[PDB]
Design a protein around this nucleic acid. Structure first.
Lengths: 511, 249, 705
RNA sequence: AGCAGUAGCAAGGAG
RNA sequence: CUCCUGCUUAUGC
């Protein structure tokens, strides 16, 4: 029972892996069974203290919390897959029988007149004009014949990649040649950009109310007892009355319908290029209507693994003049004229080739789950308030309480805009939506390090005299993950402006 | 007459050549590691493959001879319910599930269903007959305890329950005789007068016995009184910043 | 007008405005391509931290061996992390540790551990994560790799009759003595392998890339061991599990909130007239490259000094398997021409021959790892990778936090896997520099490197421990994963109730305020409805399943008793998250509807909630066209034999079927036993008993031949 | 081209 | 650069 199998190779293996002042495991076991400590331990400890050269860094005397180094280079372009602020939609009443996306596409082919959708073969700017012209004409006569399958021509054989793949040769035959096909490997990394200036107008536009009403497909309310449930119900209803009308709701409905449709087309038909509309659904004057924002084209996705990055060709509808700084990756054509009643303004068609993935389809398509973290946060605020006053003051607290946001541009020192608390969730849902779009490695590392600086600012608010051991390597770690993400550079700039506003009262920062 | 059927099955499976090297070569416990041969890695996206499954036309594996007894090949307007592609098992659509749920035959089995799930209908009966009141809006919080959370009247400790289901259902290979038997063997005399003649399967019977005898003790944050009856009311009575309780009875 | 979302923190705390700074909502980062450079960085970074060149030649392995203990070359850069442990220093900390609580501490904890070793069956090894199967050299679940290991034992020499932990471990140590091991390759041929290659194969640990880790810019390689290391690691994790459960300055098993209240409340009552306390949040960097298993061999040689003779040699094997472990180096790299047209694949085997086709960083990492390379693997002897001893290094943290130097200035705190919170009590600030540099001194001597970039401190409680930012009075919660709400995906009945179970368990453990629960419940309701194409009857949805429901709604009398999966409304709430939908709705259903849905004669379910919508989706199509079709035949045969053993023992899934003779012999003796018991009080007929007896005897002669 | 970031995908085979 | 090869009907309170 108390006998382990004493083998031959293991007893030669255990005696080989002993520390260096020991010969065998027997001598080490007899020394460890007969061990008594001494007071030469403190001599080695202080002998480790003396050869250290390490000092702590205070903040009340050497407040070197400098602002971060935003790169002074070329401006980061607009890299979202669709258009947020420059969108234009055609509307029609929704038919219940005609509900599949191809039937919506056909009913908008007779509804939105594509016969007036004439494009010149010379674009305003971009890279490739003739391929997008022949591709747009081919998909326009493809929708005209009421079938969504592009016949193989050189335009689709050039845009969605067919045959553009390397020949993966295994190491069984290589047929070596003297100084011919000299092969090796090389990596580069990521390119660095600068501060985007277009992000403020899309933030302030994204939380602005749009008259089309409900956008997001929520569900019904369960029945309520005489419990706290009414309270929860009340909160939901009030928060719902803020988030159904905003433009972030329109973008979320756009990603859900459009990307869900592309997702089902990626399951049902690999190896065949389909034509998928880019649309929404919302209530206009009570009438349930659907919109149409663009035309998307699949790229014969054979999704073997969770990756794969298939090619989507996007034709978008816009009614504003383009910009070679913001709209850098587009291939802006001109489409025509649209009568807009308050006279008949222009119409610009945009073009962009891009890619999706199978792992970024479930997190984009199922992005209706951004109302947990905003409702989660707001209810944390209200429950802290009623936890601090011990009285049912919630309905008057959501009206008589301010929240400081949105300092102006010319000045920042103590010039802040206090809003109502029920409006605040608007801004909150905006940032959660952006956390789904611009999620990279850089946003993750930047959010860890900004949690560190939030801990430093909380140490500043209560005068606790915090300290740090190494400030050089800290800023060598934060500035490493600020390269090309627009949200990371933007939130770094707003972290610096948070340090500028907080510098006027607490003293741990710079100008 | 079941032993002749088991003799035909056991004589049937020893006819195979390479299967004789499987049995009588392993151990009795190896049946456990004969149960799991899941060659898939993790099934890392279940809802994703489920939404990809429900998007097709015929995702479901359904039996043929039961559905052809009463079902119809196609519905009143083009709704497909049947296939002829393949054991004799036929693929089908969930419109046949809702069509079975609205235009199918019915067998009265309310007593069996209302006797298997007595613990959960006891939870509904205890939930419907309570009364609440106003909230408090105060700071609350307490450490984590190990609480039995079910209003049982027997209170066994997860050791006489497996042994109890051995010495009630099938006693031919139950257990070595311990000293925990005697009064629980009077309880065996009570239980064999109940589970003798039923249409309930022995796995469903062993399921439904273990939910009336086992107080589920978990490691949960509790506060106030530690009565078990308000332990399914744990998440409803109070959180971290709020508390609501006015239960009289 | 500019806009700043951070300004709420001007008049709030970090306990409410901290869930705003988590990007736990978007897509996680995945890895792409090979994971060879991460393994080269981990192994070469491990050898760079060894601080020595003392190499010892080996007689078993054909590669050199570098020592990691008591061989230091003291560089001037001591702030750089070291990987060298002084064994007399840490044994002095162990003797100083056991003199704090009790006298027979290690004897009591070791007798509890050995009290739980001898009552353990090895099927607990099948209740684990993925392991490395060396038969086909892949990543498999634990039952499949264990079954291929036992298949190699019963195929090589004799059979297996162990059914315990200790006899299976002695079976593996018996396999180390075998001169030749025979197994099966792929169409199931039988191959053989020698003795030293079996030693090279039993200690092989597979490395891959960690997918889905929120919070890093650079990726990291995670490691999965084989099967012959896992039960010994289970032994060591039970011993260190009982040690961590017995101690009072650790937080691994979990309450993690009461202990900090007792040490902040208790150590603030130990102050003099001029002393004060400063707490420091730290974060130990390079934790998986500075914990050598030789110190585990020394301390695990010290704990079991008076335990037994079986435990004294049984808790001194997994460090010896960790002192000589191999590392799978991924699958190589790829090369291409100047035109970027043809791209050859170079595996990890021929990386030595194709050495001159690499980059600058690949050759810099490869020339520092070259005298330790095997053909496919690498020889690591001082690392402790992820997926290994976790409850044992926390004991080293408690050994650092219980140092006694003899003023009255000292420290305490709390330890986790790589997160410590340290409370310092002293009188002046240069004395604070003395005590903190003594803490970095004792951690630096013992082998624990604090990161100087991710550490800070304050005077009151404003510290950080396992992503719960504790302020002066309030407590922030763990930002939970949003994908865990919908991960069932198996049935029209086990999705909504499973999601209500996830909302309940996230409500009890975490905070999860009620409006968040109702919002997440309603969103998971909408994703259920959109997933299974079932909408309410008053809606205007017209698909292939709502035409039947809209057509046949006139037969149903009570309309709010229909299920959610059949076009009903919502009746569950926050106060009904423990009651399923069917059991809540059966008090209002029509009798034709309730007798129609719950009919067990259904073509879908026939062949924890009520099984009435339980269908099985169809299988794939490429599972019977590849070269692994015969493995699906093998699991078919396994399910046939398991259906036979289920058909013999009518109650077998309730109790664990222990036994060590055979399966078919208990079948035959069982049919004879119930044939006699049901014979004498029962049957009575000559042709039936003689026919069953004839089939048992003919099946026994067929099985024996 | 494009997605993407420390390396892959963007059908396969033959010359 | 040149030449040969494919089925999967998708409906947001």
């Amino acid at each position: 029972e108390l006998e382990m199998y004493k083998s031959k190779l293991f007893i030669a293996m255990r005696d080989e892996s002993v520390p260096l002042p020991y010969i065998n495991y027997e001598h080490l076991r007899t020394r460890c069974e007969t061990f008594k400590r001494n007071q030469a331990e403190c001599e080695a400890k202080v002998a480790d203290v003396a050869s250290r050269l390490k000092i702590k860094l205070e903040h009340l005397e050497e407040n070197k919390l400098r602002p971060l180094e935003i790169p002074k280079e070329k401006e980061a372009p607009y890299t979202h897959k669709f258009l947020m602020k420059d969108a234009w939609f055609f509307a029609k009443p929704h038919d219940s029988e005609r509900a599949q996306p191809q039937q919506i596409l056909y009913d908008f082919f007779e509804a939105a007149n594509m016969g007036f959708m004439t494009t010149s073969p010379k674009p305003i700017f971009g890279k490739q004009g003739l391929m997008y012209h022949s591709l747009w004409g081919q998909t326009k006569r493809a929708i005209k014949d009421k079938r969504n399958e592009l016949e193989p021509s050189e335009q689709r054989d050039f845009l969605c990649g067919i045959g553009r793949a390397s020949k993966k040769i295994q190491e069984d035959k290589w047929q070596e040649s003297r100084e011919e096909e000299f092969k090796q490997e090389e990596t580069k990394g990521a390119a660095k950009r600068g501060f985007p200036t277009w992000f403020n107008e899309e933030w302030l536009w994204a939380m602005r109310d749009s008259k089309i009403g409900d956008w997001i497909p929520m569900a019904e309310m369960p029945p309520c007892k005489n419990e706290m449930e009414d309270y929860a119900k009340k909160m939901c209803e009030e928060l719902e009355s803020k988030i159904q009308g905003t433009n972030c709701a329109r973008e979320m409905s756009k990603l859900i319908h459009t990307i869900g449709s592309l997702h089902t087309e990626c399951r049902n038909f690999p190896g065949k290029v389909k034509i998928v509309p880019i649309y929404c659904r919302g209530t206009l004057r009570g009438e349930s209507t659907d919109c149409l924002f663009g035309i998307a084209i699949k790229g014969k996705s054979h999704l073997n693994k969770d990756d794969g990055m298939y090619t989507v060709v996007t034709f978008e509808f816009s009614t504003e003049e383009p910009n070679p700084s913001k709209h850098e990756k587009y291939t802006v054509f001109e489409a025509g004229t649209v009568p807009v009643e308050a006279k008949e303004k222009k119409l610009f068609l945009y073009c962009r080739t891009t890619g999706m993935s199978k792992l970024k389809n479930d997190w984009f398509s199922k992005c209706r789950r951004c109302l947990i973290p905003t409702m989660e946060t707001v209810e944390q605020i209200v429950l802290k308030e009623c936890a601090l006053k011990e009285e049912n003051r919630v309905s008057e607290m959501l009206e008589n309480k301010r929240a400081w946001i949105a300092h102006e541009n010319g000045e920042n020192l103590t010039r802040l805009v206090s809003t109502k608390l029920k409006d605040l969730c608007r801004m909150l849902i905006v940032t959660q939506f952006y956390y789904c779009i611009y999620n990279d490695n850089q946003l993750e590392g930047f959010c860890n390090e900004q949690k560190k600086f939030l801990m430093f600012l909380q140490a500043d608010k209560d005068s606790k005299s915090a300290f740090t051991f190494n400030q050089k390597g800290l800023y060598e770690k934060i500035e490493e993950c600020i390269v090309s993400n627009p949200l990371c550079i933007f939130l770094a700039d707003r972290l610096n402006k948070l340090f500028l506003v907080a510098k006027s009262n607490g003293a741990k920062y710079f100008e | 007459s079941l032993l002749l059927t088991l003799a035909k099955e056991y004589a049937n499976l020893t006819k195979d050549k390479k299967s004789c090297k499987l049995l009588s070569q392993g151990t009795v416990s190896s049946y456990t590691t004969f149960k799991k041969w899941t060659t898939s890695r993790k099934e890392k996206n279940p809802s994703l493959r489920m939404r990809w499954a429900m998007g097709s036309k015929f995702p479901i594996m359904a039996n043929r001879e039961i559905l052809e007894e009463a079902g119809i090949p196609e519905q009143w307007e083009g709704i497909d319910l049947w296939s002829k592609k393949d054991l004799g098992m036929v693929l089908a659509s969930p419109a046949a599930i809702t069509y079975w749920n609205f235009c199918g035959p019915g067998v009265d089995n309310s007593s069996v269903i209302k006797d298997v799930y007595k613990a959960k209908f006891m939870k509904k009966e205890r939930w419907r007959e309570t009364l609440w009141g106003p909230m408090n809006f105060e700071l609350v919080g307490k450490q984590r305890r190990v609480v039995e959370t079910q209003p049982v009247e027997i209170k066994l400790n997860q050791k006489e329950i497996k042994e109890l289901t051995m010495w009630v259902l099938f006693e031919d290979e139950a257990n070595l005789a311990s000293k925990f038997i005697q009064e629980n063997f009077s309880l065996v005399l009570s239980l064999r007068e109940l589970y003798k003649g039923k249409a309930v399967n022995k796995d469903v019977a062993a399921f439904m016995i273990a939910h009336q005898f086992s107080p589920e003790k978990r490691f949960l944050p509790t506060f106030g009184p530690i009565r078990p009856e308000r332990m399914e009311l744990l998440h409803c009575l109070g959180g971290d910043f709020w508390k609501i309780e006015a239960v009289t009875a | 007008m500019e806009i700043n979302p951070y300004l709420l923190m001007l008049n709030n705390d970090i306990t409410s405005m901290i869930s705003l700074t988590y990007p736990y909502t978007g897509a996680p980062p995945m890895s792409h391509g090979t994971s060879t450079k991460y393994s080269m960085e981990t192994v070469s970074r491990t050898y760079s931290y060894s601080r020595t060149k003392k190499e010892v030649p080996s007689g078993i392995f054909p590669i050199e061996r570098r020592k990691f203990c008591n061989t230091i070359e003291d560089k001037e850069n001591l702030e750089k992390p070291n990987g060298n442990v002084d064994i007399n220093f840490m044994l002095s900390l162990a003797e100083m540790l056991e003199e704090k609580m009790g006298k027979g501490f290690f004897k009591f904890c070791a007798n509890e551990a050995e009290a739980e070793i001898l009552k353990m069956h090895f099927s607990k090894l099948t209740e684990g994560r993925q392991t490395y199967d060396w038969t086909s050299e892949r990543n498999m679940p634990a039952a499949t790799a264990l079954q291929l290991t036992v298949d190699a034992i019963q195929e090589t020499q004799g059979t297996f009759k162990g059914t315990t932990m200790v006899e299976y471990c002695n079976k593996i140590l018996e396999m180390m003595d075998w001169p030749e091991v025979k197994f099966k390759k792929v169409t199931l041929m039988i191959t053989k392998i020698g003795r030293e290659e079996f030693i090279k194969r039993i200690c092989t640990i597979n490395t891959m890339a960690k997918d889905g880790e929120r919070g890093k810019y650079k990726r990291r390689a995670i490691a999965t061991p084989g099967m012959g290391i896992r039960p010994f690691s289970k032994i060591v994790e039970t011993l260190a599990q009982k040690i961590c459960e017995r101690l009072a300055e650790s937080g691994l098993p979990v309450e993690k909130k009461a202990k900090l209240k007792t040490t902040v409340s208790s150590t603030n009552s130990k102050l003099q007239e001029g002393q004060f306390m400063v707490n420091i949040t730290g974060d130990n960097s390079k934790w998986n490259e500075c914990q050598q298993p030789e110190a585990y061999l020394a301390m695990l040689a010290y704990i079991t000094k008076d335990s037994s003779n079986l435990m004294k040699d049984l808790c001194s094997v997994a460090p010896t398997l960790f002192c000589n472990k191999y590392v799978k180096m991924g699958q190589g790299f790829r090369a291409k021409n100047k035109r970027k047209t043809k791209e050859i694949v170079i595996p990890a085997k021929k990386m030595k021959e194709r050495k001159e086709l690499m980059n600058a960083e690949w050759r810099d990492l490869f020339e520092t790892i070259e005298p330790y390379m095997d053909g496919e693997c690498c020889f690591l002897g001082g690392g402790m990778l992820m997926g290994m001893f976790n409850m044992l290094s926390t004991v080293f943290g408690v050994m650092t936090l219980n140092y006694r130097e003899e003023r009255n200035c000292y420290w305490t705190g709390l330890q986790s896997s790589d997160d410590f919170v340290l409370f310092c009590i002293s009188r002046t600030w240069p004395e604070m520099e003395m005590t903190i540099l003594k803490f970095i001194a004792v951690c630096k001597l013992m082998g624990i490197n604090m990161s100087l970039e991710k550490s800070y401190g304050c005077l009151p409680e404003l510290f950080e421990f396992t992503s719960m930012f504790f302020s002066g009075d309030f407590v922030s919660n763990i930002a939970l994963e949003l994908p865990a709400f919908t991960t069932a995906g198996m049935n029209e009945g086990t999705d909504f109730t499973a999601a209500m179970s996830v909302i309940r368990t996230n409500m009890i453990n975490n905070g999860l305020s009620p409006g968040t629960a109702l919002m997440a419940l309603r969103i998971c309701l909408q994703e259920f409805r959109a997933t299974y194409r079932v909408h309410p009857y008053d809606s205007g949805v017209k698909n292939h399943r709502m035409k039947i429901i809209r057509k046949f709604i006139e037969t149903i009398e009570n309309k709010d008793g229909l299920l959610i999966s059949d076009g009903g409304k919502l009746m569950n709430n926050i106060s009904s998250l423990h009651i399923p939908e069917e059991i809540l709705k059966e008090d209002l259903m029509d009798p034709s509807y309730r007798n129609r849905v719950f009919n067990p004669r259904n073509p879908f379910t026939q062949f924890a909630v009520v099984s009435t919508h339980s269908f099985r989706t169809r299988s794939n199509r490429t599972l019977l066209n590849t070269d692994m079709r015969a493995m699906a035949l093998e699991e078919k045969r396994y399910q046939v034999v398991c259906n036979m053993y289920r058909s013999v023992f009518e109650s077998a899934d309730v109790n664990t079927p222990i036994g060590s003779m055979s399966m078919g012999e208990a079948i035959e003796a069982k049919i004879l036993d119930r044939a006699r018991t049901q014979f004498e009080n029962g049957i009575i007929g000559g042709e039936e008993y003689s026919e069953i007896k004839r089939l048992i005897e003919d099946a026994k002669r067929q099985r024996l031949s």
